[PDB]
């Protein structure tokens, strides 16, 4: 389902952020995983700032379990 704020974000931006996510992780599987991750926050978020936070907060918690 499409929300109002989704109009702000282009597919070129989504593809850019998905591939920033793949960098934070045959290659098709990992990219498929990131599209699933990014897609979930895209639909779940209520605005762009929250959308960017869900991203930011996800790389932060990806880069913490790997630390320990």
Swiss-Prot record:
Modified residues (Asymmetric dimethylarginine): 14, 26
Domain KIX: 1-67
Compartment(s): Cytoplasm; Nucleus; Chromosome
Residues modified to N6-acetyllysine: 58
Post-translational modification: Acetylated on Lys at up to 17 positions by intermolecular autocatalysis. Methylated at Arg-14 and Arg-26 in the KIX domain by CARM1, which blocks association with CREB, inhibits CREB signaling and activates apoptotic response.
Function: Functions as a histone acetyltransferase and regulates transcription via chromatin remodeling. Acetylates all four core histones in nucleosomes. Histone acetylation gives an epigenetic tag for transcriptional activation. Mediates acetylation of histone H3 at 'Lys-122' (H3K122ac), a modification that localizes at the surface of the histone octamer and stimulates transcription, possibly by promoting nucleosome instability. Mediates acetylation of histone H3 at 'Lys-18' and 'Lys-27' (H3K18ac and H3K27ac, respectively). (Microbial infection) In case of HIV-1 infection, it is recruited by the viral protein Tat. Regulates Tat's transactivating activity and may help inducing chromatin remodeling of proviral genes. Binds to and may be involved in the transforming capacity of the adenovirus E1A protein.
Domain notes: The CRD1 domain (cell cycle regulatory domain 1) mediates transcriptional repression of a subset of p300 responsive genes; it can be de-repressed by CDKN1A/p21WAF1 at least at some promoters. It contains sumoylation and acetylation sites and the same lysine residues may be targeted for the respective modifications. It is proposed that deacetylation by SIRT1 allows sumoylation leading to suppressed activity.
Subunit structure: Interacts with HIF1A; the interaction is stimulated in response to hypoxia and inhibited by CITED2. Probably part of a complex with HIF1A and CREBBP. Interacts (via N-terminus) with TFAP2A (via N-terminus); the interaction requires CITED2. Interacts (via CH1 domain) with CITED2 (via C-terminus). Interacts with CITED1 (unphosphorylated form preferentially and via C-terminus). Interacts with ESR1; the interaction is estrogen-dependent and enhanced by CITED1. Interacts with HIPK2. (Microbial infection) Interacts with human adenovirus 5 E1A protein; this interaction stimulates the acetylation of RB1 by recruiting EP300 and RB1 into a multimeric-protein complex.
Associated clinical condition: Defects in EP300 may play a role in epithelial cancer.
UniProt-recorded name of the protein: Histone acetyltransferase p300
Native source species: Homo sapiens
Gene name of the record: EP300
